[PDB]
Design an enzyme around this catalytic site. Structure first.
Site, PDB file in Angstrom:
ATOM      1  N   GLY A  19      31.518  35.022  43.346  1.00 46.51           N
ATOM      2  CA  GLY A  19      31.787  33.821  44.477  1.00 46.51           C
ATOM      3  C   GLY A  19      33.178  33.681  44.336  1.00 46.51           C
ATOM      4  N   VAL A  21      36.813  31.642  44.369  1.00 49.86           N
ATOM      5  CA  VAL A  21      37.489  30.799  43.447  1.00 49.86           C
ATOM      6  C   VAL A  21      38.532  29.981  44.197  1.00 49.86           C
ATOM      7  CG1 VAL A  21      38.775  30.620  41.248  1.00 49.86           C
ATOM      8  CG2 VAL A  21      37.240  32.576  41.588  1.00 49.86           C
ATOM      9  N   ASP A 130      30.830  43.368  32.356  1.00 50.98           N
ATOM     10  CA  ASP A 130      31.680  43.871  33.343  1.00 50.98           C
ATOM     11  C   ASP A 130      33.043  43.585  33.340  1.00 50.98           C
ATOM     12  OD1 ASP A 130      29.286  44.149  34.721  1.00 50.98           O
ATOM     13  OD2 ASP A 130      29.151  42.052  35.497  1.00 50.98           O
ATOM     14  N   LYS A 132      36.850  44.666  33.248  1.00 51.14           N
ATOM     15  CA  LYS A 132      37.683  45.453  33.977  1.00 51.14           C
ATOM     16  C   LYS A 132      39.232  44.819  34.179  1.00 51.14           C
ATOM     17  CE  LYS A 132      35.361  43.870  38.012  1.00 51.14           C
ATOM     18  NZ  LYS A 132      34.342  42.966  36.950  1.00 51.14           N
ATOM     19  N   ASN A 135      39.542  41.313  35.539  1.00 51.40           N
ATOM     20  CA  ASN A 135      39.173  40.012  34.597  1.00 51.40           C
ATOM     21  C   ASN A 135      40.180  39.924  33.482  1.00 51.40           C
ATOM     22  OD1 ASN A 135      35.916  41.517  34.720  1.00 51.40           O
ATOM     23  ND2 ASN A 135      36.577  39.399  35.811  1.00 51.40           N
ATOM     24  N   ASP A 151      35.246  35.384  33.225  1.00 48.47           N
ATOM     25  CA  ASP A 151      33.878  35.959  33.465  1.00 48.47           C
ATOM     26  C   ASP A 151      33.120  36.364  32.369  1.00 48.47           C
ATOM     27  OD1 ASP A 151      34.033  35.479  36.354  1.00 48.47           O
ATOM     28  OD2 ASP A 151      34.553  37.706  36.636  1.00 48.47           O
ATOM     29  N   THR A 170      34.196  48.908  39.749  1.00 45.75           N
ATOM     30  CA  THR A 170      33.327  48.516  38.790  1.00 45.75           C
ATOM     31  C   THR A 170      32.901  49.834  37.957  1.00 45.75           C
ATOM     32  OG1 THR A 170      31.503  48.746  40.413  1.00 45.75           O
ATOM     33  CG2 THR A 170      32.488  46.499  39.910  1.00 45.75           C
ATOM     34  N   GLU A 377      37.961  26.487  73.561  1.00 50.77           N
ATOM     35  CA  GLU A 377      39.430  26.671  73.313  1.00 50.77           C
ATOM     36  C   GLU A 377      39.343  26.415  71.864  1.00 50.77           C
ATOM     37  OE1 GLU A 377      42.608  25.547  75.990  1.00 50.77           O
ATOM     38  OE2 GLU A 377      41.168  24.844  77.539  1.00 50.77           O
ATOM     39  N   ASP A 436      43.057  59.606  65.815  1.00 42.96           N
ATOM     40  CA  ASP A 436      44.156  60.766  65.737  1.00 42.96           C
ATOM     41  C   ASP A 436      43.666  61.972  66.384  1.00 42.96           C
ATOM     42  OD1 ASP A 436      46.254  62.522  64.991  1.00 42.96           O
ATOM     43  OD2 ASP A 436      45.731  62.623  62.908  1.00 42.96           O
TER      44      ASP A 436
HETATM   45  C1  V68 Z   1      30.585  29.200  33.496  1.00 41.22           C
HETATM   46  C2  V68 Z   1      31.253  30.447  32.989  1.00 41.22           C
HETATM   47  C3  V68 Z   1      30.406  31.473  32.367  1.00 41.22           C
HETATM   48  C4  V68 Z   1      32.301  30.998  33.899  1.00 41.22           C
HETATM   49  O1  V68 Z   1      32.988  29.879  34.689  1.00 41.22           O
HETATM   50  C5  V68 Z   1      34.070  30.126  35.380  1.00 41.22           C
HETATM   51  C6  V68 Z   1      35.053  29.061  35.582  1.00 41.22           C
HETATM   52  C7  V68 Z   1      36.340  29.531  36.278  1.00 41.22           C
HETATM   53  C8  V68 Z   1      36.496  30.686  36.580  1.00 41.22           C
HETATM   54  C9  V68 Z   1      37.699  31.199  37.178  1.00 41.22           C
HETATM   55  C10 V68 Z   1      38.223  32.579  37.444  1.00 41.22           C
HETATM   56  C11 V68 Z   1      39.280  32.578  37.992  1.00 41.22           C
HETATM   57  N1  V68 Z   1      39.680  33.752  39.268  1.00 41.22           N
HETATM   58  N2  V68 Z   1      40.882  33.507  39.593  1.00 41.22           N
HETATM   59  C12 V68 Z   1      41.430  34.222  40.431  1.00 41.22           C
HETATM   60  C13 V68 Z   1      41.021  35.633  41.047  1.00 41.22           C
HETATM   61  C14 V68 Z   1      40.370  35.439  42.131  1.00 41.22           C
HETATM   62  C15 V68 Z   1      40.327  36.685  43.068  1.00 41.22           C
HETATM   63  N3  V68 Z   1      41.900  37.032  43.459  1.00 41.22           N
HETATM   64  C16 V68 Z   1      42.003  38.057  44.735  1.00 41.22           C
HETATM   65  C17 V68 Z   1      42.033  37.704  42.133  1.00 41.22           C
HETATM   66  C18 V68 Z   1      42.255  36.601  41.090  1.00 41.22           C
HETATM   67  C19 V68 Z   1      41.442  32.666  38.856  1.00 41.22           C
HETATM   68  N4  V68 Z   1      42.786  32.401  38.909  1.00 41.22           N
HETATM   69  C20 V68 Z   1      43.225  31.455  37.758  1.00 41.22           C
HETATM   70  N5  V68 Z   1      42.448  30.934  37.053  1.00 41.22           N
HETATM   71  C21 V68 Z   1      41.155  31.488  36.788  1.00 41.22           C
HETATM   72  N6  V68 Z   1      40.305  30.811  35.984  1.00 41.22           N
HETATM   73  C22 V68 Z   1      40.606  32.111  37.728  1.00 41.22           C
HETATM   74  C23 V68 Z   1      37.389  33.492  36.989  1.00 41.22           C
HETATM   75  C24 V68 Z   1      35.954  33.089  36.548  1.00 41.22           C
HETATM   76  C25 V68 Z   1      35.654  31.937  36.159  1.00 41.22           C
HETATM   77  C26 V68 Z   1      34.578  31.655  35.572  1.00 41.22           C
END
Ligand code: V68
Length: 458
Positions: A19, A21, A130, A132, A135, A151, A170, A377, A436
């Site tokens: 999803g 964020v 997952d 990587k 994450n 994650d 992945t 428009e 090209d």
């Molecule tokens: C219920 C749990 C098992 C998991 O719940 C969550 C809640 C918030 C989350 C938030 C992120 C998250 N994702 N992201 C940003 C990514 C989003 C895509 N860009 C391109 C790269 C970075 C965050 N940046 C700052 N803080 C964060 N906490 C995040 C990733 C996983 C998450 C899982």
């Protein structure tokens, strides 16, 4: 409890696993958070509601400096709202490539943090699967910032996307046993081993010209340390990697035991810079981000084709007498109607955000927002804005990848990019022949963009 009763959207951070964020803010306390929004139509659940709710309740009580803190959980008809602590340092690899030097001490400090986090989650019977580089977030922009793993717990409860735009990067990190179906917490150690291998060499241990070729290497499980830059690396680091990349999971080292490994004990408590590794990581990262941006650009063009016609049809229906004019409230109602069905824009999750977005479009085109408006428009400007933003995002990735500022990407480089993007070999070559026509064996940005347009039916 309704998510938007409590939280307002600040800005979309981006599409992560499962999803979008969104940076959000509590409407009473002002607390900022990062909310992962999962669309129920695009993502299927693996477990029942009893299981998911209990996992969330456990996660909310867990606490570790290297694991993302979960605050709240919300569910409605269409979406899950996962509210976690927001980190501002960005992805680990993006910080690594910007620094001048990088040694085994830096790597060992990084891996100890990852292993500490994993160790803690494994004690609580939670597996990532997952794991990587994307994450691994940095808590803040400070030079010494802690790594926060995101994650954990998600793969257990949701089926992963089969769309390649979601599957980029992945295949390198997935454990062999995950591919065949019988896996346990040890798969996280494998993935961390792959990450360590990359930190010290800048090249994946299992690599190939496309996704399935990478998966074939992973499945065989064989790798070597015969590359030149492994001459710089200590035997203890290679010994730890071997133990983490042991094929049979029962024989593979645990996360907790890896924390006691000689290499971690020596280098985290004299050492040259791994200059070849940082250069290879910069190329790896650049290549990976441009492939991702390419797929996202193509995805955005298709979303635009879809949304432009749907939005036009919605307003046509609304325009009773058929003179093409609707007022601001009607534009809001129709734009709601659109974002309602589509899971594309998560920052359009409540009426207030839609009101704001509509006002931004009207303010762009210099239309007065208090009278009746030519909707055709409005549609054009609303969509052209998204087209422009998508184009600019791709261009930034192109410039990032073009590190010598040549203005060009070579055919050899295109093969690499399209291989990671899993675009078929004869397909992109066919499109390159179309663009090209002088056998230059290279493309500038506009030509690259044209190739991508031709690869999504334009
Ligand atoms: C219920 C749990 C098992 C998991 O719940 C969550 C809640 C918030 C989350 C938030 C992120 C998250 N994702 N992201 C940003 C990514 C989003 C895509 N860009 C391109 C790269 C970075 C965050 N940046 C700052 N803080 C964060 N906490 C995040 C990733 C996983 C998450 C899982």
């Amino acid at each position: 409890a309704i998510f938007s009763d409590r939280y307002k959207g600040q800005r979309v951070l981006g599409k992560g696993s499962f999803g979008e964020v969104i940076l959000c803010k509590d409407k009473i306390t002002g607390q900022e958070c990062a909310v992962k929004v999962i669309s129920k139509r695009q993502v299927k659940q693996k477990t029942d509601k009893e299981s998911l709710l209990r996992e969330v309740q456990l996660l909310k009580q867990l606490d570790h400096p290297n694991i993302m803190k979960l605050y709240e959980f919300f569910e409605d008809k269409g979406y899950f709202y996962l509210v976690g602590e927001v980190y501002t340092g960005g992805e680990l690899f993006d910080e690594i490539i910007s620094r001048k030097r990088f040694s085994e001490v830096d790597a060992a400090r990084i891996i100890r943090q990852v292993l500490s986090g994993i160790t803690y989650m494994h004690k609580n019977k939670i597996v990532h699967r997952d794991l990587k580089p994307e994450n691994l977030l940095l808590e803040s922009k400070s030079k010494d910032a802690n790594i926060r793993i995101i994650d954990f717990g998600l793969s257990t409860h949701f089926e992963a996307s089969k769309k390649m735009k979601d599957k980029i990067g992945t295949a390198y990190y997935i454990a062999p046993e995950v591919l065949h179906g019988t896996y346990d917490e040890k798969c996280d150690v494998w993935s961390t081993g792959v990450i360590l291998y990359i930190l010290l060499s800048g090249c994946p241990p299992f690599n190939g010209a496309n996704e399935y070729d990478i998966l074939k290497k992973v499945e065989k499980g064989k790798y070597t340390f015969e590359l030149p830059q492994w001459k710089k690396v200590s035997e203890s680091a290679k010994d730890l990697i071997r133990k983490m990349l042991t094929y049979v999971p029962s024989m593979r080292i645990s996360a907790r035991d890896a924390l006691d490994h000689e290499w971690i004990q020596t280098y985290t408590k004299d050492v040259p810079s791994l200059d070849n590794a940082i250069l290879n990581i910069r190329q790896f990262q650049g290549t990976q981000k441009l492939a991702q941006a390419a797929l996202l650009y193509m995805g955005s063009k298709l979303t635009s084709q879809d949304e432009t016609k749907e939005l036009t049809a919605i307003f046509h229906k609304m325009d009773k007498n058929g003179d093409g004019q609707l007022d601001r409230a009607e534009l809001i109602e129709g734009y709601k109607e659109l974002m309602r069905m589509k899971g594309q824009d998560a920052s359009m999750l409540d009426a207030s955000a839609v009101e704001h977005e509509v006002d931004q479009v009207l303010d762009a085109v210099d239309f007065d927002k208090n009278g009746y408006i030519e909707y055709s428009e409005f549609v054009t400007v609303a969509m052209d804005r998204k087209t422009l933003l998508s184009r600019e995002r791709l261009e930034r990735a192109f410039r990032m990848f073009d590190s010598d500022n040549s203005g060009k990407i070579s055919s050899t480089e295109l093969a690499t990019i399209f291989g990671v993007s899993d675009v078929d070999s004869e397909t992109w070559k066919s499109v390159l022949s179309e663009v090209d026509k002088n056998n230059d064996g290279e493309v500038d940005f506009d030509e690259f963009q044209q190739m991508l347009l031709k690869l999504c039916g334009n």
